[PDB]
Amino acid sequence: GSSGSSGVRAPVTKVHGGAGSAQRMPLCDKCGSGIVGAVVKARDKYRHPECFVCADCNLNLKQKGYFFVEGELYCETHARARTSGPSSG
Ligand SMILES: [Zn+2]
Ligand SMILES: [Zn+2]
């Protein structure tokens, strides 16, 4: 018998900011290619109208319900598996 106890908690933080020069346009995090004309931004990130897809099946989430798991995107199917049973927020 061990009858021991443990406990650990490591929070996380994010930061975004950049100064210099640019064409005032979002950079597709998918093909890293300047976006001009038509873009698709879910929450804070931006993705082309064609690049927007799952990371496992590459399914166009544009029309479908996009998801955010660990920064990466996913379809209702895959995503659901990842965020399966989310916490009360
Ligand atoms: Zn793109
Ligand atoms: Zn998928």
Swiss-Prot record:
Pinpoint the LIM zinc-binding domain residues. 26-83
Q: Where in the cell is it found?
A: Cytoplasm, Myofibril, Sarcomere, Z line
Superkingdom, according to UniProt? Eukaryota
Q: Self-association or partners: how does it assemble?
A: Interacts with ACTN2. Forms a heterodimer with PDLIM4 (via LIM domain).
User: What is the documented function of this protein?
Assistant: May play a role in the organization of actin filament arrays within muscle cells.
Report what the protein is called: PDZ and LIM domain protein 3
Which organism does this record belong to?
A: Mus musculus (Mouse)
